[PDB]
Design a protein around this ligand. Structure first.
Ligand SMILES: Nc1ncnc2c1ncn2[C@@H]1O[C@H](COP(=O)(O)OP(=O)(O)OP(=O)(O)O)[C@@H](O)[C@H]1O
Ligand SMILES: Nc1ncnc2c1ncn2[C@@H]1O[C@H](COP(=O)(O)OP(=O)(O)OP(=O)(O)O)[C@@H](O)[C@H]1O
Ligand SMILES: Nc1ncnc2c1ncn2[C@@H]1O[C@H](COP(=O)(O)OP(=O)(O)OP(=O)(O)O)[C@@H](O)[C@H]1O
Ligand SMILES: Nc1ncnc2c1ncn2[C@@H]1O[C@H](COP(=O)(O)OP(=O)(O)OP(=O)(O)O)[C@@H](O)[C@H]1O
Ligand SMILES: Nc1ncnc2c1ncn2[C@@H]1O[C@H](COP(=O)(O)OP(=O)(O)OP(=O)(O)O)[C@@H](O)[C@H]1O
Ligand SMILES: [Mg+2]
Ligand SMILES: [Mg+2]
Ligand SMILES: [Mg+2]
Ligand SMILES: [Mg+2]
Ligand SMILES: [Mg+2]
Lengths: 49, 278, 51, 141, 260, 354, 147, 351
């Protein structure tokens, strides 16, 4: 799990939950990305913002 | 590597050709303001040892404030023309730049260039552009302007008594200035440029009309004695329109009718006061 | 680097790629000190107060 | 503040310093986190003279300091030109534990202030500072 | 490894859409602007001008059309836990509850009774009455009984720091309300932003009036509102704008007078 | 085709070319070292090409540097902002002074400040005055301020910068002030030049003491403009024309006679002025029968020039409604009464500079 | 005050057996210095719930919508630390005092009051949050606030 | 040389591969050369323009350049804001001039000023008159202003740009002005075209002088709109329609006779108009042949068109309430009471 996360781990903002394992997240630079939510993420802790 | 201090400056000093042609004699009737500026800017540059011996602490900066058109920028021009020190003319709105960090960078560049070329005078016209008292933390413009103002305060605070650099700020809306800029060590000399008095009005009229081919029939005291609260720019506009009317009728001598018409045109004051109130 | 020396609001140096915290830089200006630098109240003592 | 080694904090309400107080800036009591970090502290606000923001900040800080503040040795000072303009909430007994008047210096106090401030200057011997003090009726420091 | 990250961009213009080589101008947020082409796994008709897309980081070819951007504050305004109040908890409001239900609940539950007779049910209800009379209680009952998307909007939540932001929130609220087959929007204390327009010399309540005008335009404007059935409750209905108090925006005016 | 092959080979040679980063020379350190700042980027210590002059690389000179080594490849003239280029290359519409009625006095005042000083500077030098550089055309809406500016731009043979003040506002930090600076830099580099900023109250409004961040940015733009009109550097052979129908809201520093020297009031037309405007706008109208312009003037009290053009348009529209190929006096009567009726919805117009 | 902010937490069985929810809100009103804030301090001394103290004048913000935002966040924090007691001291000071830093005038104060109305009794379900308000001028409060 | 030409084109195709970097041509120098600004906020100098003729370029032109060499590869169409492109109608609403009751004079006044100049332009050039520029439609809510806008968009083949005031109110400075001028440019490029600005009072609020604060940004947007309507560049190819409930709020510079030549008042529908509106809105409704629309019109004093439509809607509600499949006159009479929204009263002691 640590290897999959890697280092460093950037801090972004959950903009939208497109799917169960897909979400649109915006980094600190204001650029949004359509990325995948990995399994070990606590998916019940995910809300917009 | 370490670059020379005078290098890496987006702002340049005033060259010989860039010196304004305005003289102290060109400015009419600001003896109080001239004396305050000289005692706070041009005298400490040449007589810092005298200031130290007497015990006076020379003011690091000068804030020139007053109604618009009352000789602020022109007095700065005259200082630049009649100084043996370096002059660095700048405007507050120039510091606000798209590239984040370039504003404070060029502020410290200006101060570093002035320090490296001491004696030097830094003139920042329209200081309200980077010295307002209200800042919105969620807007990039206000954040950058706050950074610029903080860098300006730090640069003025980092100038010990040894460095021979004098700072001049000019504004006509000093009520909107941040009080932190007026703290001791930053701007210890607030010189007001008020509207001309009657004696000031006649001095300005004489100085401006001395350059114009008038006729002996023109009596400037007719317009000086008028109770209109006009600025030096208003007087210059009155003389300019008198010359304009003289030119219109293909004349190279300004008569009294031209001056009367020019005064009526320029002042153009609506009564705005009903007689029943007094 | 000891984790107990990594206090909040400390200045640290992070490696180029891994961003690994590899040095605790000298602490920045205290926010109170920074605020009072711009406020710049004149320092005083009882000896300079008369009457 | 200097003699008791109490940290002197000036609260002018200026937005320029807000970034140092805190990124929130929604309440002035956000400054307390800084003050507690520098206890003993003296929170100072001067009313230059709508309603006064300095007196509102006084009311909020005093309300916090009444019984809801854990750390001690956090004192609070106002400076104001007039006492009859203060809000009735601030003039209520128990809020301001001591009100101190600073009348304009009389002849002797003016002489003392003159002696203090002329000491920083190259003075010729024999200056009659008493006469100059008499020459400044109703003067401030 | 397999699932590559996709940067979110916005399509701007389609050049040569008719031919077999259509080029798409995309605006990658704060990053840049590019002229790209669709990937082989996306139909040409699945990408339209002005819609958000997701592109790769190498050639920025459009890889997936994306839902429109909605403010998170607007997203949280939709109700996900229904209140614990039923219509049995409201007494003395039989006629008021019936009138409210036949507008906000009956058309959604049994639309077949309305389409057959060529009947267009009212799409707006204003509950008004003195405080404590049961306006928000009836709204909570509606939200508990409803099956469609229920969005609770408090008027004070539509007041924003910056100019035009409240109108933007209203626009996005009606945009995300239109992404559902049937939807209900509750405007509690609509007098916060629904006040009547006035000119007091200065800019008195200009921004709030613009927010109210945007809400009015969404309710009944050039574009059809959709299947949204709005619901507003206020204890000061006399302050509401006449254009907001007009049928087609607030068709039913249910009075929650004091109980007999 | 041989020429087709030549063009294809030209494209091939052009394809190997690489763009060069545009920066600005800050300071020559040594004979082979320079400090240059990219247009929007960091400052670099770079080299210079041996074949370059190195004497045209004064501080502030725009340069093109290699993409890889950042070596100064070339020196370029001062850049013209595309917005400023659009300002200069804006078609006024070939408007002549014969299309303006009742403003002969105002036209003369405007041409006294913008025309004569640029053609006969010694005429004003002999008297001993500096000719005015700024005029403000103010008045109720529709009186002909923009029409006057268009006629001036069409007739006067001089460089003209035409812009609307609301069109220079940009959301980027310091961009509007930079646009003002580039406008005045172009005007200085292309003397003689005239800058017409329409609807100056967009950015020339009074400076707020308790405004928002956007208001502060707009005020920074305004008083960058103020420093350009009358600041430390004297403006030579550049004239400024500013038009607004609400001069009461303008900043007092902008209205100061050092910047806006003349205040030309484009007032509502009087009886003779209304007659002139009606004759101008009813000229190309096909009519039979006597046309008593005097009656329309008498019932046109309070109208503006746009009002009288609308009177002509509505007279033609009444003609069309009756299926006619001509306009008679009765159509003008109905048109002027209809325009007078529509004039009741307009609020106060009497606004003057303070 | 004990029957509303202390007894419901220490002895909820009384209310459960009686079939009534405890009194929702409490406002302490009276002449200055009578002991309203002292009683609030005494409640805060012997409470097992999180105590949040806010002065009414603190709800007046410098930007539009920031007042309602602050009230909304205050009650969100109250909901997070449930059970909790929200002490809105000197509530009347939100209206009896006008500061020029408030961009919106009385209308922004009214919007903040409407947000407070929604938080006290509105659409959103309220957890174990008890509200205590104190004021020496209760005649200046909006009657819908203390309904 | 044909094979060499084809191989050169093949190499160009390799270099001309997507993606392009979108840039704006800033300047054209001679020592033939270009200066461009990429969307990455980078300014580049191109000694050779590239695959685009330098004559076909002007400052501000949108181009697609090589992502690596930044050499101009092609010229791109004019860039308009996505909101402006989204405010252009393409469904072309299905209304008709027969669906509007009691506004025949208003429909005629709008059509002969917006539609007639576009179609029958020869009626104006022969007359030598300029066609009316801009039409404002002001009146009480529910009079049928937006309905007439929908009808005008229905019966016109010209490009239609639906728009509301609050859409032009933007957070950032110059964004509203950019939107207004982009909409007008888009309408110009698709001329003949009509721009409908609903709720004009959102941006049309009168300017004012203040010392502390004010809404100068919305006034800047309004000033941009004023310049677009009648400014330095006379735009006589785009027709402008605006609508408002409160004409007393609008800036007098907006109500000018060059910007909004015709200011049509939409009145309360009179008795015949009210009956006609009820008949219009009862078309798709199963109504018994005994309803007296004249009587309903007599019973609906001070009813706007929206209230008249709501009368039919509530009559349908009541018919469904009692289970009847046909609407009777009593249903309309009782729905008039519902639309009136009279407060509950026990005034049975009168008379
Ligand atoms: N004492 C004076 N004697 C002669 N001319 C004067 C005097 N004061 C001002 N002027 C005139 O003022 C004009 C320019 O005004 P100036 O720039 O000095 O004003 P300011 O205080 O800097 O104005 P603002 O606050 O608007 O920047 C000059 O043309 C000059 O003739
Ligand atoms: N008709 C009713 N039947 C039963 N209980 C009622 C009724 N009306 C009010 N109540 C009770 O009184 C409380 C008043 O709160 P409610 O949300 O209904 O008020 P409101 O009408 O929205 O007031 P406000 O205008 O101040 O927002 C309800 O929570 C409920 O417990
Ligand atoms: N004196 C005039 N002679 C002829 N036409 C005039 C005159 N004044 C105004 N007009 C006509 O009025 C219309 C609008 O005039 P213009 O655009 O110059 O207005 P303006 O003064 O700039 O008003 P606003 O303050 O609204 O910008 C034009 O069609 C123009 O022909
Ligand atoms: N009834 C009382 N018994 C004991 N002490 C009291 C009593 N009333 C007030 N006090 C004392 O007075 C002090 C100040 O009173 P307190 O601040 O509680 O009054 P308040 O009514 O809330 O006033 P305000 O309206 O000014 O906020 C308290 O800390 C307490 O020590
Ligand atoms: N004269 C009319 N004839 C037919 N239908 C009408 C008439 N007036 C209004 N309506 C009906 O009213 C409804 C809404 O009217 P519309 O939106 O056009 O009003 P408006 O005057 O533009 O309103 P607002 O000023 O509030 O924007 C439509 O369903 C329309 O059919
Ligand atoms: Mg000046
Ligand atoms: Mg409620
Ligand atoms: Mg104009
Ligand atoms: Mg208390
Ligand atoms: Mg409408």
């Amino acid at each position: 799990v640590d290897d999959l996360r890697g280092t460093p781990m950037s801090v972004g903002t959950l903009e939208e939950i497109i799917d169960d394992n897909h979400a649109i997240v915006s980094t600190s630079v204001g650029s949004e990305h359509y990325v995948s939510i990995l399994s070990f993420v606590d998916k019940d802790l995910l809300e917009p913002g | 590597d370490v670059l020379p201090p005078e290098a890496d400056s987006s702002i340049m000093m005033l060259t010989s050709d860039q010196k304004p042609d305005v003289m102290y004699a060109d400015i009419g009737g600001m003896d109080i303001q001239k004396q305050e500026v000289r005692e706070a800017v041009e005298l400490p540059l040449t007589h810092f040892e005298l200031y130290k011996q007497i015990g006076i602490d020379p003011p690091r900066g000068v804030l020139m404030y007053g109604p618009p058109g009352c000789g602020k920028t022109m007095l700065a021009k005259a200082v630049a023309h009649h100084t043996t020190a370096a002059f660095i003319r700048v405007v507050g709105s120039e510091f606000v730049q798209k590239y984040l960090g370039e504003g404070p960078r060029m502020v410290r560049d200006v101060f570093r260039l002035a320090k490296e070329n001491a004696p030097a005078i830094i003139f920042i016209d329209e200081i309200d552009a980077i010295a307002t008292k209200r800042f919105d933390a969620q807007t990039g413009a206000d954040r950058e302007v706050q950074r610029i103002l903080l860098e300006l305060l730090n640069q003025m605070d980092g100038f010990d008594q040894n460095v021979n650099v004098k700072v001049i700020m000019a504004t006509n809306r000093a009520d909107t200035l941040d009080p932190a800029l007026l703290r001791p060590g930053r701007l210890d000399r607030k010189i007001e440029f008020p509207l001309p008095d009657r004696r000031q009005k006649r001095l300005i009229f004489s100085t401006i009309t001395s350059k114009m081919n008038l006729s002996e029939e023109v009596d400037l005291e007719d317009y000086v004695a008028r109770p209109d609260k006009i600025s030096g720019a208003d007087i210059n506009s009155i003389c300019q329109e008198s010359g304009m009317l003289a030119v219109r009728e293909n004349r190279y001598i300004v008569l009294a009718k031209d001056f009367e018409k020019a005064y009526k045109t320029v002042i153009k004051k609506d009564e705005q006061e009903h007689e029943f109130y007094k | 680097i000891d984790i107990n020396d990594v206090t909040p609001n400390c200045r640290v140096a992070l490696r180029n790629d891994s961003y690994t915290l590899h040095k605790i830089l000298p602490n920045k200006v205290d926010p109170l000190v920074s605020l009072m630098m711009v406020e710049k109240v004149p320092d005083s003592t009882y000896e300079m107060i008369g009457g | 503040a200097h003699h008791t080694d109490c940290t002197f904090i000036r609260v002018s309400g200026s937005e320029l310093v807000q970034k140092f107080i805190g990124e929130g800036a929604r309440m002035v009591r956000e400054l307390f986190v800084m003050a507690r970090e520098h206890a003993p502290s003296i929170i100072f606000m001067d009313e230059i003279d709508g309603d006064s923001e300095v007196q509102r900040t006084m009311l909020e800080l005093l309300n916090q300091l009444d019984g809801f503040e854990a750390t001690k040795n956090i004192k609070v000072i106002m400076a104001t030109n007039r006492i009859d303009i203060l809000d009735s909430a601030l003039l209520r007994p128990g809020r301001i534990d001591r009100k101190i008047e600073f009348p304009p210096p009389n002849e002797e106090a003016r002489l003392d202030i003159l002696k203090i401030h002329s000491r920083k200057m190259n003075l010729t011997r024999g200056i009659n500072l008493r006469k100059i003090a008499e020459l400044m009726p109703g003067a401030s420091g | 490894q397999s699932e590559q990250p996709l940067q979110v961009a916005r399509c701007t213009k389609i050049i040569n859409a008719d031919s077999e080589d259509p080029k798409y101008i995309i605006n990658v947020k704060q990053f840049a602007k590019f002229v790209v082409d669709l990937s082989d796994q996306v139909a040409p008709t699945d990408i339209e001008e002005g819609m958000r897309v997701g592109v790769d980081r190498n050639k920025y070819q459009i890889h997936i059309p994306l839902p429109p951007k909605i403010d998170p504050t607007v997203t949280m305004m939709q109700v996900e836990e229904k209140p614990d109040v039923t219509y049995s908890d409201v007494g003395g409001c039989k006629e008021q509850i019936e009138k409210l239900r036949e507008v906000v609940e009956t058309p959604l539950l049994h639309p077949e009774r309305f389409v057959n007779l060529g009947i267009e049910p009212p799409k707006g209800v204003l509950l008004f009455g003195p405080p404590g009379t049961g306006k928000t209680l009836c709204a909570r009952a509606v939200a508990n009984r409803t099956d469609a998307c229920f969005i609770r909007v408090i008027g004070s939540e539509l007041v924003q720091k910056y100019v035009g932001e409240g109108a933007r929130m209203v626009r996005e609220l009606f945009e995300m309300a239109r992404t559902k087959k049937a939807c209900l929007i509750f405007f509690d204390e609509i007098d916060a932003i629904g006040g009547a327009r006035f000119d007091d010399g200065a800019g008195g309540d200009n921004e709030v009036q613009r927010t109210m005008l945007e809400l009015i335009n969404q309710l009944d404007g050039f574009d059809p509102r959709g299947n949204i059935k709005v619901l507003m409750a206020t204890n000061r209905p006399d302050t509401l704008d006449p254009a907001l108090m007009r049928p087609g925006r607030l068709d039913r005016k249910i009075e929650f007078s004091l109980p007999d | 085709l041989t020429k087709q092959y030549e063009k294809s080979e030209n494209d091939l040679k052009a394809l190997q070319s690489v763009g060069q980063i545009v920066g600005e020379v800050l300071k020559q350190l040594t004979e082979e070292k320079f400090i240059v700042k990219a247009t929007n980027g960091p400052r670099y210590v770079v080299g210079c090409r041996r074949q370059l002059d190195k004497s045209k690389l004064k501080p502030g000179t725009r340069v093109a540097l290699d993409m890889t080594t950042l070596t100064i490849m070339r020196y370029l003239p001062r850049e013209v902002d595309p917005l400023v280029y659009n300002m200069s290359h804006e078609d006024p519409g070939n408007v002549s002074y014969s299309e303006i009625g009742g403003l002969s006095e105002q036209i003369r005042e405007l041409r006294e400040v913008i025309e004569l000083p640029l053609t006969n500077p010694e005429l004003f030098q002999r008297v001993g005055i500096i000719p005015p550089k700024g005029c403000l055309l103010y008045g109720p809406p529709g009186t002909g301020k923009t029409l006057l500016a268009r006629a001036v731009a069409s007739q006067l043979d001089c460089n003209f910068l035409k812009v609307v003040s609301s069109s220079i506002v940009d959301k980027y930090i310091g961009e509007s002030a930079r646009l003002i600076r580039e406008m005045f830099n172009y005007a200085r580099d292309h003397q003689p030049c005239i800058i017409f900023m329409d609807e100056i109250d967009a950015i020339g409004g009074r400076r707020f003491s308790e405004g928002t961040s956007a208001d502060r940015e707009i005020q920074r733009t305004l008083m960058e403009l103020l420093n350009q009109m009358d600041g430390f550097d004297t403006l030579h052979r550049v004239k400024m024309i500013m038009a607004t129908n609400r001069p009461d809201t303008l900043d007092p520093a902008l209205l100061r006679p050092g910047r806006l020297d003349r205040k030309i009031h484009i007032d509502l037309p009087n009886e003779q002025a209304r007659l002139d405007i009606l004759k101008i706008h009813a000229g190309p109208i096909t009519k039979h029968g006597e046309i008593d312009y005097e009656a329309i003037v008498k019932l046109s009290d309070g109208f503006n020039g746009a009002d009288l053009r609308n009177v002509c348009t509505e007279a033609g529209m009444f003609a069309i409604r009756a299926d006619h190929d001509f306009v008679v006096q009765e159509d003008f009567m109905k048109a002027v009464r209809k325009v007078a009726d529509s004039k009741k919805l307009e609020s106060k117009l009497d606004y003057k500079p303070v | 005050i004990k029957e509303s902010v202390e007894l419901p937490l220490t002895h909820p069985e009384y209310y459960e057996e009686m079939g009534i929810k405890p009194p929702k809100g409490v406002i302490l009103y009276g002449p200055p210095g009578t002991g309203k804030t002292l009683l609030a301090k005494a409640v805060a001394n012997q409470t097992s719930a999180t105590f949040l103290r806010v002065v009414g004048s603190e709800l007046i913000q410098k930007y539009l919508g920031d007042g309602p935002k602050l009230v909304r966040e205050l009650f969100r924090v109250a909901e997070e630390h449930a059970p909790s007691i929200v002490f809105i001291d000197e509530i009347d000071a939100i209206g009896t005092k006008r500061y020029d830093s408030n961009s919106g005038g009385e209308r922004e104060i009214q919007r903040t009051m409407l947000e407070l109305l929604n938080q006290l009794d509105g659409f959103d379900s309220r957890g174990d949050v008890k509200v205590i308000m104190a004021t020496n001028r209760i005649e200046t409060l909006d009657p819908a606030l203390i309904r | 040389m044909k094979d060499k030409i084809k191989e050169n084109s093949e190499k160009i195709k390799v270099n001309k591969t997507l993606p392009y970097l979108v840039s704006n041509v800033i300047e054209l120098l001679d020592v033939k050369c270009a200066v461009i600004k990429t969307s990455t906020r980078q300014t580049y100098f191109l000694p050779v323009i590239g695959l685009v003729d330098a004559e076909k370029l002007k400052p501000g032109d949108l181009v697609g350049v090589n992502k690596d060499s930044y050499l101009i590869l092609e010229t791109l169409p004019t860039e308009y804001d996505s909101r402006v492109k989204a405010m252009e109608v393409d469904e072309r609403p299905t209304e008709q001039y027969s669906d509007i009751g009691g506004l025949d004079k208003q429909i005629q006044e709008l059509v002969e000023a917006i539609v007639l100049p576009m179609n029958h332009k020869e009626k104006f050039e022969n007359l030598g008159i300029q066609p009316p520029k801009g039409v404002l439609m002001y009146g009480p809510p529910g009079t049928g202003k937006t309905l007439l806008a929908r009808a005008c968009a229905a019966q016109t083949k010209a490009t239609f740009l639906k728009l509301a005031g609050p859409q032009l109110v933007q957070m950032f400075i110059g964004d509203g002005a950019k939107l207004v001028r982009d909409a007008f440019a888009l309408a110009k490029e698709k001329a003949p075209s009509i721009i409908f600005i609903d709720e004009l009072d959102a941006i049309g609020t009168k300017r004012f002088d203040s010392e502390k604060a004010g809404d100068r940004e919305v006034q800047r947007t309004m000033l941009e709109l004023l310049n677009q309507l009648d400014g330095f560049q006379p735009n006589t190819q785009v027709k402008v329609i605006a609508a408002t409930n409160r004409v007393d709020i609008l800036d007098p510079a907006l109500l000018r006779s060059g910007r909004l030549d015709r200011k049509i008042e939409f009145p309360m529908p009179n008795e015949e108009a009210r009956a006609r509106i009820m008949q219009i809105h009862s078309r798709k409704m199963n109504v018994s042949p005994d309803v007296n629309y004249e009587e309903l019109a007599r019973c609906t004093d001070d009813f706007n068109g929206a209230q008249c439509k709501a009368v039919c809607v509530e009559a349908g509600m009541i018919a469904l309430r009692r289970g009847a499949t046909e609407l009777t006159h009593e249903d309309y009479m009782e729905g008039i009471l519902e639309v009136q929204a009279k407060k509950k009263a026990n005034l049975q002691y009168y008379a």
